Amino acid sequence: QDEVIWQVVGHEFCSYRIKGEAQNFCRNEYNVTGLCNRQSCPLANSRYA
Amino acid sequence: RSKPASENVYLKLLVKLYRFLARRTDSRFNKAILKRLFQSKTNRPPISISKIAALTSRKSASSQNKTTVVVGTVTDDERMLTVPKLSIAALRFTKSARARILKAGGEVLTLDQLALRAPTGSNTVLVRGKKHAREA
Amino acid sequence: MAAARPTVSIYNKDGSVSSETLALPFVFKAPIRPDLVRSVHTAVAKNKRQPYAVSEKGNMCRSGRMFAPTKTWRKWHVKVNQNEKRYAIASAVAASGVPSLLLARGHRIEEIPEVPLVVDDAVQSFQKTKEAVALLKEIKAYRDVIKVANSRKLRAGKGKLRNRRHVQRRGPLVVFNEDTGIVKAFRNIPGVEIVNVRRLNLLQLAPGGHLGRFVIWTKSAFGLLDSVFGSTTEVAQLKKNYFLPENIISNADVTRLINSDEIQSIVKAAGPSRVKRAHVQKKNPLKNKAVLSRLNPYAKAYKANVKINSEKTPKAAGEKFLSVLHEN
Amino acid sequence: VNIIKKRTKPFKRHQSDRFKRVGESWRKPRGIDSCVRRRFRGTISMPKIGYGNNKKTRYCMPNGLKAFLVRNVSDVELLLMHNKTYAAEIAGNVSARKRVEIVEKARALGVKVTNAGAKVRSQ
RNA sequence: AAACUUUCAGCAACGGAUCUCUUGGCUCUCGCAUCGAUGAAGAACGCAGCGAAAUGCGAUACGUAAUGUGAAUUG
RNA sequence: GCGAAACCACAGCCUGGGGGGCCAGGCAAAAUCAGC
RNA sequence: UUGAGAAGCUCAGACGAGUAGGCAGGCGUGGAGGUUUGUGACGAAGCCUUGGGCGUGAGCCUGGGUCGAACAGCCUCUAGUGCAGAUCUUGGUGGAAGUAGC
RNA sequence: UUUCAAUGGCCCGUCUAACACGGACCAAGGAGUCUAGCAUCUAUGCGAGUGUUUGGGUGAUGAAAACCCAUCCGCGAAGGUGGGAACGCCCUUGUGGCGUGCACCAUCGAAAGAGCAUAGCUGUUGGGACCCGAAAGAUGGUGAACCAUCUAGUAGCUGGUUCCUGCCGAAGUUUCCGGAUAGCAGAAACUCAGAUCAGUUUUAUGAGUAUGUAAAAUGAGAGUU
RNA sequence: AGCUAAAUAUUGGCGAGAGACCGAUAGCGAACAAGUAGAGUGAUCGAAAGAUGAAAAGAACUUUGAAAAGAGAGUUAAAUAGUACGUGAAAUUGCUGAAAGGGAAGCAUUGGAAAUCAGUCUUACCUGGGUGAGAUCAGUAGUCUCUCGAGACUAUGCA
C-alpha cells in the first residue's frame, strides 16, 4: 500500500508532478521539500509531517 | 540481463526484494532466485503438479519438510489422481493447481512468503521446468 | 489482499454517518496495475472510432493524389481477451478504494469524509438536481464538481471545427443499482457520470489510462460488488467462470519485509553508505617528505654516505695487468 | 562552483551561411564524399559528447541558479525551499497583471525572478 | 575622396507564406421508395423597377390561388 | 518610346609544379566603350 | 549526515576514428483521452530582432517591436509527423539588360 | 554584432582521380504507408487447455460504446550409471568428506504434456506497395490521326528518399554447387576457473641453417552450440 | 408449366445524424460565378480565385493637377485595418546610416577598434537597552467544529 502508491504515482503519472529539466517538482500542498522524491512524496510516504 | 523485460509492478517488487537478498547474504540461492526473475516467459517454462510430486517423492521419497520452489507457473496434471502432501512456492498458480494442493496437502506460496520462511533458502528444492518443446 | 479495513461506514443523504456498515467487497484487494489498465484502456478507447478516408478516385505535384491513400479497412477496432478486460475493471475499482490514488489522479476530494464513499439507498430516488447539489455539499464532494465547472476551456486546435469545442475535467462517478431518478437527478451536474454497478466501463473507471477515479457508491450497489466480482477463491455470481486474480507478491509492500525480523537477523554485517573517497591525489614519495615516511618506515635511518675509506687507500694494480693494459 | 562552458559558439550546419534555404540548426552530413564528415582540418567542428559540460554546473545560468518557468502565482510557491539554486523565470504569455503579483511574492521568498521588469513600469 | 560593387542595420516596396477561422469537402451510419405520351431528363428563348459567368419563374413569367404565421421589403 | 529570351554551383589575370580553386612565384587600383 | 524517484544515491579503473550493418536514448509537428484549483483583450498564436539564457545536439525558455483570438507544459494513444537535392509540383522574384530587338 | 589583423579553409549531392549528372534564388507541397498471411523475439491474460463481438441478450446519462453469453467451431492435448543448478549434515574451519540431485549433456535400458489468445518490434511474401521515369496493347468513340477508359501498361534499371546524440562494428578471399558452407561482426542460452587457450618465443624428438611433431617461458580468462 | 413476403445488396434518388478526417497548393475539378471562364472542327479537356471593420462610420470640405491620383484634412480603439484592405515570412527591389573593396568573396579559430547588452547589488544582514503595542501569555472567564485536548474564535488584563 506504499510501494503500490509509488510505482503508480511515482513512475506512471501523478497530477502534481512538474517535469523540470534537472529536477522534478511536486505541486502538493503538504510537501516538505517541494520535489517529487520517494522519501518526499506525501502520497507514497504514508506517515508524513 | 539487469532489469526484467516486463512492466508488472508487482514484479519490480520481487526484484527489489531478491536483489537486496542477493547482496546482503552468502547464499547462492538468492543469486539464483534473482537470476531467474529476469528471464523471459519462454525461458521460465511451466511445471506440472505431477512432476513436482515425482521429483521430491522418489528413490527414498525424501519429502520431509522441504518447500519446492519454481520461478514459473505451477500448472496442473489431471492424470495424477491422488495428490501428496506437498508445499510449493511459485509466482503463479493455476486455479486447478491451487485447489488440488489445498484439498489434501500443504501451502501455496509466493516468493514473498518464501523469503519469510527460508530467508537464506535452506531446506528447499530449486526446480525448473523443461525448456524443450522438441521443435520450438 | 494482505490486510484492510473490514467494515465501511455507510452515510446518509444529510451528511451524517449511519450505524449500519457493510463488509469490504473482495474486489478492493485486487492487484493495482498501472500497466495492464494502460494496455486495455488503450484498446477499449479505439472501439468507437468512426472511420475516415479520402475519395478513392503523383503525390509531389499539386492537384495530385496523396501518397498511398488512407483506406476504410484500416484496423480501427482491436481485440482484447475478456479475462484481461475483466482484470482491468477489477484493478481499476480497487484503485477507487485507495484515498491516495484519487488525489494523484487529479481530484479535489481533500475534504471527503471516507473512502470508499457509500451514501445510503435513498439517494436512488433523488429527483431534482437541487437534491444532488444538496448531497454533494454535505459530504464535501462538491469541490470536485467546482473543479469541473471552473475549468472548461476552448479546445486547443481544430477539435472545435469538428464538433468538440470544450475540454474539462472528470468529477465523481455515481454508481447506482436501480434507476429511480438517480440518473436524471445527477446528469446535469458537470463532471458527474452515472453507471450501473453491473455494466461498469473502463473508460470511466480509468479515464485517460490513469487509475483512481473518484467513485461515489450507493449502498444498494455496494452490496452487489461481491456478486459481480466475487472473491479470489469463489466464483462471481453474475459472471460464469470468473475468479478474481491473485498476486505475484503475497504482501503488497516489499520495503517492509526487508526491514522485518525475518531478514535482518540473518543478513551479513553491513557496509557503509556512499563510501569515502580514498586516494584522491597521487602523492609522490620522492618529492613529498610525508608520504615517503608513510610507505617506507626506514627513512629515519639511512646514512646514504658512509665514509668507508680514508687517506690510506692502497693502489691495487698488478704488473702483469698493466703489461697487458699498455701492450700495443 | 564557478560555472564554465566548454564551448560558447554554437554549432552551425555546413553551408547554412551561404544558402538561405538551409537553416542554421545543426544537421550531421550523410555523405562519405564530404570533406566535413571525414573531418578534414580547417572545416567547421561538430557536436560531440566531448563538449558536454559539468554534470553539476549544468543548466545553470552564469550566476549559478538554474531556471524555472513560473506561469502562475502558485508555481513560484514551490521555490520556497530552493531560493539559492533556482531562478523563477516567468513564462512569456502571462498577462501584465498576473506578472506583477508573482514578483511581489517571489520577492518575499527571496527568489530571483530573472525578467520581473517586463510590462511593469514602476512609479 | 565621391560613384560603383559587396556587407550590415533602419525605412519604404514587392510577394502572399505562417497563424487563426470555415454556410465547403471527404468518410461512416440510420430512415425512406417518389420520373415519362396526363409529355420526363436535357436544350433554346423570355420574364426582375433599377442586374452585370448567379437564382427563381413561363406571356397568370425573380410567379397566382388555398392555408398558416403575422406587418414587412430594402441598395 | 516599347522591350524580351536563352542561360545562370560560385566564378573570372598569367608562369611553373601536383584546374579557375592548390603550392611557389610574376604582379595588383577604380568606371566604361569600339575592333578582337 | 538526512545522498531511498533502489528506475535513486555513491566509489574506482580502463576506454573514445568509423564504411555496409546492428543496438539504444532522446528532439520536434497535426489530432485523441487524462492532468496542470493551466496561460489569454492588462493581448493567445504567429512574425521580426545589432538583446539575454539553457542543452553536446536535434531544440527549448525569454526581453523588445508588431499583432489581434485563441493556446500550451506533463503522462499515455495516434499518424497524411521533420527536406537542400528528384533535368522535382505550384507560386513569387532576380542576373543576363533597358542588352537582343521594332 | 560590423570590420581589421595572423593562420587555416578546393562546391554541395549522386555516382565511379577528375569527371559526368543535379543545382538562379525563396516559399508551401513531396517519398518504406495501409491490409492479409507466415516466422522470430518480447510483454500480458489464462493454462491441458485457450479464443466474448457470425450472432443473441442488454445498454434512458454518443445506445455504433460498455457489459453479459447459449450452440458449434478453430489451434493443442514412467530405467539405472556419470556429470550438473541449488540445498542439508560434516570436521581437515575451510579444504575435503557426506546425502538429496532440477534443466541440459554423455552412457548403457527399452519417457509424466505447454499451449491458446491479444499487443508491440524486426523480417518475409502478396497486393499500387517508398516516390518518379521507361516505346505497349486492348475496348469504345471523334474526324478524316485524335479522344477518354481499363492503367495507379512495363526496370534487369536512371534519379530522389526528409531529426540529434551515443555504443559495437566487418569482409571485400575462399569451398562446392547465382544458391551453399566456412570465416570476419554480432544476440541469448549453457558451459569451465582451468593448462582451456595464444598470426609468439624456448627446450626435446626426429626430418635432409631450414622442416613438422611434444611438454617450458611469456602474457590473457577461455568454450559451446 | 407458374407464383410468393422476411432475413440480403445499395459510391445513385428524397432526407437525417455523426466523425481521434482535410483546413483554401489541403479536402470533391469546384468553400467564391465551377463543369463556370476558357481550349479544341469534334469526341472531349477544363482552371485561377476565401477573410476591411464591432459597426462603411468606405474618407465631407479646401487646394494642385486635363486626367489618373497627390496633399492638407476627417471617421475608427486600430488607416501600423483604406476594398492593391486580418496577421503580412523569405527571395527581390529603391533610399538613408555606418563600413569594406590593389587582376575574389564565402567560413572556421584567437584577439583589437566602434556600437550595444546583461548582471539583484539594491541594500540587505545581524546584535543590546529603553519606550509602547498582544497572544500562541493570563496562580484568568465563554462559543463552535473535531478529538481529556487540537485547532477557530469572541471578551478582559496585557502583569
Curated annotation (Swiss-Prot), chain A:
Location within or outside the cell: Cytoplasm; Nucleus
Organism domain of life: Eukaryota
Family as reported in the entry's similarity comment: Belongs to the MAK16 family.
Record-given protein name: Protein mak16
Species in which this protein is naturally found: Schizosaccharomyces pombe (strain 972 / ATCC 24843) (Fission yeast)
Full-length numbering of the shown residues: 3 to 51 of 302
From Swiss-Prot, chain B:
Coiled-coil features, chain-numbered ranges: none
GO CC annotation: cytosol; cytosolic large ribosomal subunit; preribosome
Residue(s) carrying Phosphothreonine: T73, T75, T120, T124
Primary location group: cytoplasm
Entry's localization field: Cytoplasm
Keyword Oxidoreductase: no
GO molecular function, one term: RNA binding
GO biological process: cytoplasmic translation
Superkingdom per UniProt: Eukaryota
Keywords: Cytoplasm, Phosphoprotein, Ribonucleoprotein, Ribosomal protein
Modified residues (Phosphoserine): S2, S50, S122
Family, similarity comment: Belongs to the eukaryotic ribosomal protein eL18 family.
Protein's job: Component of the ribosome, a large ribonucleoprotein complex responsible for the synthesis of proteins in the cell. The small ribosomal subunit (SSU) binds messenger RNAs (mRNAs) and translates the encoded message by selecting cognate aminoacyl-transfer RNA (tRNA) molecules. The large subunit (LSU) contains the ribosomal catalytic site termed the peptidyl transferase center (PTC), which catalyzes the formation of peptide bonds, thereby polymerizing the amino acids delivered by tRNAs into a polypeptide chain.
Something else known: There are 2 genes for eL18 in S.pombe.
Self-association state and partner proteins as the record states: Component of the large ribosomal subunit (LSU). Mature yeast ribosomes consist of a small (40S) and a large (60S) subunit. The 40S small subunit contains 1 molecule of ribosomal RNA (18S rRNA) and at least 33 different proteins. The large 60S subunit contains 3 rRNA molecules (25S, 5.8S and 5S rRNA) and at least 46 different proteins. eL18 interacts with NAP1.
Descriptive protein name: Large ribosomal subunit protein eL18A
Residues of the full protein shown: 15 to 150 of 187
Swiss-Prot record, chain C:
Keywords: Cytoplasm, Ribonucleoprotein, Ribosomal protein
Subcellular location(s) per record: Cytoplasm
Keyword Chaperone belongs to the record: no
GO terms for cellular component: cytosol; cytosolic large ribosomal subunit; preribosome
SUPFAM superfamilies: Ribosomal protein L4
Pfam families: Ribos_L4_asso_C, Ribosomal_L4
Region spans: C-terminal-extended nuclear localization signal: 245-328
InterPro entries given in the database record: Ribos_uL4_C_dom, Ribosomal_uL4, Ribosomal_uL4_dom_sf, Ribosomal_uL4_euk/arc_CS, Ribosomal_uL4_euk/arch
UniProt function note: Component of the ribosome, a large ribonucleoprotein complex responsible for the synthesis of proteins in the cell. The small ribosomal subunit (SSU) binds messenger RNAs (mRNAs) and translates the encoded message by selecting cognate aminoacyl-transfer RNA (tRNA) molecules. The large subunit (LSU) contains the ribosomal catalytic site termed the peptidyl transferase center (PTC), which catalyzes the formation of peptide bonds, thereby polymerizing the amino acids delivered by tRNAs into a polypeptide chain.
Note: There are 2 genes for uL4 in S.pombe.
PANTHER family tied to this protein: 60S RIBOSOMAL PROTEIN L4
Entry protein name: Large ribosomal subunit protein uL4B
Lineage: Eukaryota, Fungi, Dikarya, Ascomycota, Taphrinomycotina
Curated annotation (Swiss-Prot), chain D:
Subcellular localization: Cytoplasm; Nucleus
A GO biological-process term: cytoplasmic translation
SMART domains the record matches: Ribosomal_L32e (SM01393)
Name used for this protein in its record: Large ribosomal subunit protein eL32A
InterPro entries associated with the record: Ribosomal_eL32 (IPR001515), Ribosomal_eL32_CS (IPR018263), Ribosomal_eL32_sf (IPR036351)
Domain of life: Eukaryota
One function term, GO molecular function aspect: structural constituent of ribosome
Family note: Belongs to the eukaryotic ribosomal protein eL32 family.
Organism of derivation: Schizosaccharomyces pombe (strain 972 / ATCC 24843) (Fission yeast)
Gene Ontology terms: cellular component: cytosol; cytosolic large ribosomal subunit; nucleus; preribosome
